[PDB]
């Protein structure tokens, strides 16, 4: 299986697997059952921004979701990523729909990773930023139903010509180049990622969510990881 760490923007509450009785954002450490959640006033049809940050000094992974002139949902969990992930991973976005649907459109996505080795200023870094997505976006790995070029956005899941979302759909996007997320002789390792999304639901019942994830280099969409599994895990364990 794949090692997965993710911050999920869960739009549908499945209490059968531990979901809070309402929209929430959470931190998953190898399990769809979040280790920490936080109510989230999901604003259907509006563009929102998501900020995820981490550093090895605090060893605390944090995230904030917000909409303009609206409030901010915050969640944080303490986790040493050196024990959970391999030093070489890949990053990306995942999202799904099941019985109910929603558009999981990504308007922009940027990321930045930094390594300060224990030899002073042995700083290595990686940075990418997407505000436009081309039809043929060669630096991205598209798995499942994810596509690009549409109005310059990334559609992680199925959406018809009429612009309405589809049910039972799974799609992800990963950056082409592997990322050195941590090293032993490292004094401070940190990364921060941002992305704007537009979750729209005509049927008024949104599902299932969008997620930012970190996995092993060769991570692929798991069987039946559609709907409530956010295309991240193979079972609700």
């Amino acid at each position: 299986a794949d090692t997965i760490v993710a911050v999920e923007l869960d739009t549908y509450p499945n209490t059968d697997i531990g979901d809070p009785s309402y929209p929430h954002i959470g931190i998953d450490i190898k399990s769809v059952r979040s280790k920490k959640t936080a109510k989230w006033n999901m604003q259907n049809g509006k563009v929102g921004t998501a900020h995820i940050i981490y550093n090895s000094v605090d060893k605390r992974l944090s995230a904030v979701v917000s909409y303009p002139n609206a409030d901010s949902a915050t969640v944080s969990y303490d986790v040493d990523l050196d024990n959970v992930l391999p030093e070489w991973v890949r990053v990306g976005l995942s999202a799904s729909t099941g019985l109910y649907k929603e558009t999981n459109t990504i308007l922009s996505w940027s990321f930045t990773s930094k390594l300060k080795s224990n030899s002073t200023h042995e700083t290595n870094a990686l940075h990418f930023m997407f505000n436009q997505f081309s039809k043929d976006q060669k630096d991205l790995i598209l798995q499942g139903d994810a596509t690009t070029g549409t109005d310059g956005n990334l559609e992680l899941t199925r959406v018809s010509s009429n612009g309405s979302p589809q049910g039972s759909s799974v799609g992800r996007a990963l950056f082409y180049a592997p990322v050195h997320i941590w090293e032993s002789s490292a004094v401070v390792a940190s990364f921060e990622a941002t992305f704007t999304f537009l979750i729209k639901s005509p049927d008024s019942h949104p599902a299932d969510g969008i997620a930012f994830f970190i996995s092993n280099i060769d991570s692929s969409i798991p069987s039946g990881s559609t709907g409530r599994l956010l295309g991240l895990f193979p079972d609700a364990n």
């Binding site: 006033n41 999901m42 409030d71 049927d203």
Partner: peptide, 12 residues
């Protein structure tokens, strides 16, 4: 184009 389908939209 869409209005508070379900999730509580604070404001409009």
């Amino acid at each position: 184009d869409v209005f508070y389908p379900y999730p509580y939209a604070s404001g409009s």
